[PDB]
Amino acid sequence: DTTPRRDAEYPPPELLEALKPLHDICLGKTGVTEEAIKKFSDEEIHEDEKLKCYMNCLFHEAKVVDDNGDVHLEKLHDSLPSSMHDIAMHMGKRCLYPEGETLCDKAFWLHKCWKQSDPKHYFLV
Amino acid sequence: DTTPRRDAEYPPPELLEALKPLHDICLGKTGVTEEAIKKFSDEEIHEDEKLKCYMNCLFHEAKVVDDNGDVHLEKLHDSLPSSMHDIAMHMGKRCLYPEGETLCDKAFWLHKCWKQSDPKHYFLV
Ligand SMILES: CCN(CC)C(=O)c1cccc(C)c1
Ligand SMILES: CCN(CC)C(=O)c1cccc(C)c1
Ligand SMILES: [Cl-]
Ligand SMILES: [Cl-]
Ligand SMILES: [Mg+2]
Ligand SMILES: [Mg+2]
């Protein structure tokens, strides 16, 4: 099943809460719309350059990046609730090696790869 | 459970069979001993420089490397039987980013990291 799962247990409320201030920071900086975030989360994969940089910004603000600003998938995994560790692993197992010229391109590459892999459990806020 | 699992079912016999010709090639190329391989597989981590290159050679001969000879973990995962997929996932989840000067160093880094992560299922032939 590919329908996004959105209920009281998933996405983990603690992760949603933790992401709220990072959302404020990154939406402020990039000027992405809330609509574009919601559509990417719950509807079709779509192209929006500010959204790509919004995705990069969340990784940077969450401190899940290396010295070059590239996503460090282990740091990212560590930062997620343990309840979603297995789902996350499977979502990212064919998404190890982002491609793209810029950090925004590579961040978007990751989100798109995850959403293609597990659209039910992929989300973005 | 940290003791190496060695029985008629695991390691998968079909994988051991497929590895045999690669072992012959790579031992010839690198000068590692049969004993050094068995010791690393079943006994303790140890740092034999020819073993490290043997490890690198298997990745090359198995065609699970990128254009620069670095291990491509997705390619590697796809080369393993389904029966090992989950074991390999967990074994590698904190071994994503090898460290080392040479390709032999990085290959050893991976094997050591896998063996530290799951010495029950880690093996080398
Ligand atoms: C270490 C986990 N992993 C390797 C398979 C990942 O790609 C991974 C890490 C964090 C978050 C997501 C969605 C995937
Ligand atoms: C894609 C699987 N993976 C990411 C978690 C790995 O590190 C991985 C891949 C192949 C073989 C082993 C032992 C680990
Ligand atoms: Cl889509
Ligand atoms: Cl798998
Ligand atoms: Mg020795
Ligand atoms: Mg050296």
Side-chain angles (χ1 to χ4, degrees):
Chain A
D1 182 31
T2 59
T3 303
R5 177 180 174 198
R6 309 287 183 257
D7 61 40
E9 294 295 322
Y10 194 90
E14 67 270 28
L15 182 58
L16 296 179
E17 290 296 329
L19 284 164
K20 295 184 173 192
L22 313 195
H23 164 95
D24 289 343
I25 293 163
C26 291
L27 178 143
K29 289 196 175 217
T30 58
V32 73
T33 60
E34 308 227 88
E35 167 179 45
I37 294 163
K38 178 80 153 67
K39 286 171 66 290
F40 200 90
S41 188
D42 296 347
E43 303 181 359
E44 73 264 36
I45 291 163
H46 70 94
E47 291 279 321
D48 180 312
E49 294 300 323
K50 295 174 175 168
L51 181 66
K52 305 188 183 175
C53 291
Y54 173 86
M55 296 158 167
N56 179 58
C57 180
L58 290 181
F59 291 135
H60 275 74
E61 295 293 329
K63 319 280 185 61
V64 298
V65 297
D66 68 19
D67 293 340
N68 299 136
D70 286 303
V71 178
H72 194 298
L73 290 168
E74 296 175 356
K75 297 185 191 279
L76 175 60
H77 202 230
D78 281 340
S79 78
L80 299 173
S82 62
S83 64
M84 69 182 287
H85 277 187
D86 284 359
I87 286 180
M89 281 204 312
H90 287 288
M91 185 182 278
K93 70 190 169 185
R94 289 301 180 274
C95 301
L96 297 184
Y97 303 128
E99 296 187 355
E101 301 193 328
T102 72
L103 293 174
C104 306
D105 290 318
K106 280 175 278 180
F108 178 77
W109 187 97
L110 277 171
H111 282 267
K112 181 172 176 174
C113 190
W114 295 331
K115 185 172 172 78
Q116 291 178 144
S117 175
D118 190 355
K120 173 173 293 294
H121 300 95
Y122 175 79
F123 69 93
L124 181 70
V125 292
Chain B
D1 201 343
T2 70
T3 303
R5 181 183 170 185
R6 305 293 182 254
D7 59 40
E9 188 156 47
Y10 192 91
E14 78 279 11
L15 185 54
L16 303 179
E17 284 308 312
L19 286 169
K20 284 175 176 278
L22 284 64
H23 166 108
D24 292 342
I25 291 161
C26 286
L27 183 146
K29 282 193 167 183
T30 64
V32 71
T33 65
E34 295 286 348
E35 194 189 344
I37 289 170
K38 168 75 170 62
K39 181 184 172 76
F40 199 94
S41 185
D42 289 359
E43 304 196 347
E44 46 155 357
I45 290 159
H46 69 101
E47 276 204 35
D48 171 322
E49 294 297 325
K50 302 180 186 180
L51 178 63
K52 303 185 177 169
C53 292
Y54 175 80
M55 288 164 171
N56 175 57
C57 178
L58 287 179
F59 291 134
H60 277 76
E61 297 295 322
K63 297 174 170 174
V64 298
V65 300
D66 70 14
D67 275 2
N68 300 321
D70 285 302
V71 179
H72 190 304
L73 291 168
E74 299 172 350
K75 285 182 198 266
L76 178 56
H77 207 226
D78 279 340
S79 76
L80 298 174
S82 325
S83 70
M84 288 180 71
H85 284 173
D86 195 73
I87 285 160
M89 289 284 300
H90 288 277
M91 186 183 279
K93 68 190 178 184
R94 290 307 183 272
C95 304
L96 299 176
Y97 302 125
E99 296 165 358
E101 295 161 338
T102 74
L103 288 181
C104 306
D105 294 325
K106 282 174 275 179
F108 181 77
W109 186 100
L110 274 178
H111 282 265
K112 173 172 172 176
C113 188
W114 291 334
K115 194 179 172 73
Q116 289 173 314
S117 294
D118 186 356
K120 170 173 179 176
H121 295 108
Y122 175 81
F123 66 94
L124 181 70
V125 291

